[PDB]
Amino acid sequence: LRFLPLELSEMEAFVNQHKSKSIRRQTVITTMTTLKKNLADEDAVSCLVLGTENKELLVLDPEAFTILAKMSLPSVPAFLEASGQFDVEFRLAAACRNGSIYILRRDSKRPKYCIELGAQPVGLVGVHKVLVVGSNQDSLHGFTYKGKRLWTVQMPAAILAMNLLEQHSRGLQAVMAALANEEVRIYHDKVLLNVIRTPEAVTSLCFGRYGREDNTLIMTTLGGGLIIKILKLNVPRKTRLYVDQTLREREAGTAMHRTFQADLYLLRLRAARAYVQALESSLSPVSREPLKLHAVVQGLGPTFKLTLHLQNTSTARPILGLVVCFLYNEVLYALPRAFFKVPLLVPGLNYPLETFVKSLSDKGISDIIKVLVLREGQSTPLLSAHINMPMSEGL
């Protein structure tokens, strides 16, 4: 609907002609690998490794276009989707977003999925006999088709795109690598070559030497440069105190039981007493009729910021008519608005309702301040809170 030259607002928004729509398609096919030597027929090259960004590792049939098996071993997005499963009997290799590398072979063959990494393996690299992958945490990645990481770590930093030059099934020539800080890291079969400080690197390059160069001569840069350079347990212990205590318990268990039950009865009595007294004075900042309030004081100096965090705690029911009233000592603290309505409390949101307390006493005097939250048709506070105002540190 929009031309390349044109922009949204009058070129992708001038669809008063048609404004038609359509349906979906396939995705960005972020791989390509094809079992060759049948391209003269182009149909018995049935491998079409399309690792799409809809996470499917789709393989449409080559020259038949059936895609009978569209199964993907990715289980997630593919970091190293291609250049992976070259078995000579065509066992495809796929890389998971999680970093776990799968071994999904031809027509989604079932093979153990190797998790051969600690970090994310986003560095898969072909080696001319096996499928080279790069360890995420600055570790060289070496591996064969049966899980076993053949190689030990060989890279100081995070590589980005490996390759390999020319040698046989039993063989490997110069197998280079990228770096995160982009240093060329040519690796000899028997030794390392270099570590540079140049601009950035790629996902894929190619040793396209016409005249027998070992080097790739392919360049990728933030700036888009196209390079061609060719350089038993902890079970506790018990002392005499424990055995003496257990002996006392074994010889005087009845008295302990009786006196602990008496103490528990008295404790229930006193706890019920204090709970009833609190209900009377309505001093609980947590108390059908769901609410929860607590007051925080901030700041030294003669002026303190007093923020009441109030919250409706119910499934879905707002509280319309409520109001807050402060009780202070009018000779020590100067509250501008000692009484104010509260907004409609939506269930689940903490409303901070703040005020500015100010100490008036020239001498340091710390006095309590009460807060009462109550309905507008009732006179008994719905709930209350207390705050010990700190010292003034005045002038």
Binding site: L241, F260, L266, Y275, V286, Q311, P347, N350
Partner: protein
């Protein structure tokens, strides 16, 4: 004596700590802290005869509103160790009534609420606890757990990550974070 006694209590040796604190009792020390400590030690060292009278002397000796709240908190711990979650409910609510900014009381009362079934009450109380004391790990972990139980994996992640920030060598927090990061892909 106090330091070695505390260390003896917390490394699952409450009888040696009870001895170390009975020593201070023998030397005329008469506080609210000492008697609450003696109560914790007596209960956890399994001496049920001298347990609650120590908490009573503590509540008697408390010259504050935070000391009273801590004694009621510990009495609620005694109660929940005895069972009878209603008594512990009352003790935690009284700890709140005494000291409004008592985050452990909020967390434990929310645990008991979710034990009863009231999920929204528990969520609000755990939010209050984690707002008062961010350095604690239990309110964050419990909030993340209940969220993940109902859903809301965003809140579960934001809470489990703060749990890992509070107690970075936890175990259940790690499993929670792994499950969450797995759900995100």
């Amino acid at each position: 004596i106090a330091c070695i006694g505390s260390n003896h209590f917390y490394t699952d040796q409450p009888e040696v700590a009870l001895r170390f604190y009975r020593r201070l009792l023998q030397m005329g020390v008469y506080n609210c802290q000492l008697f609450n400590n003696l109560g914790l030690c007596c209960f956890y060292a399994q001496q049920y005869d001298m347990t609650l009278t120590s908490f009573e002397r503590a509540l008697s000796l408390a010259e504050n509103e935070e000391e009273v709240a801590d004694v009621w908190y510990n009495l609620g711990h005694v109660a929940v160790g005895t069972g009878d979650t209603n008594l512990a409910h009352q003790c935690f609510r009284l700890a709140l009534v005494s000291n409004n900014q008592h985050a452990e009381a909020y967390n434990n009362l929310a645990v008991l609420e979710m034990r009863r079934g009231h999920v929204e009450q528990a969520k609000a109380l755990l939010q209050t606890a984690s707002s008062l004391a961010p350095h604690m790990y239990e309110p964050h972990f419990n909030f993340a757990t209940i969220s993940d139980k109902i859903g809301d994996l965003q809140r579960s992640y934001a809470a489990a990550k703060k749990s890992e920030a509070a107690f970075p060598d936890h175990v259940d927090t790690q499993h929670l974070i792994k499950q969450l990061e797995q759900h995100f892909a």
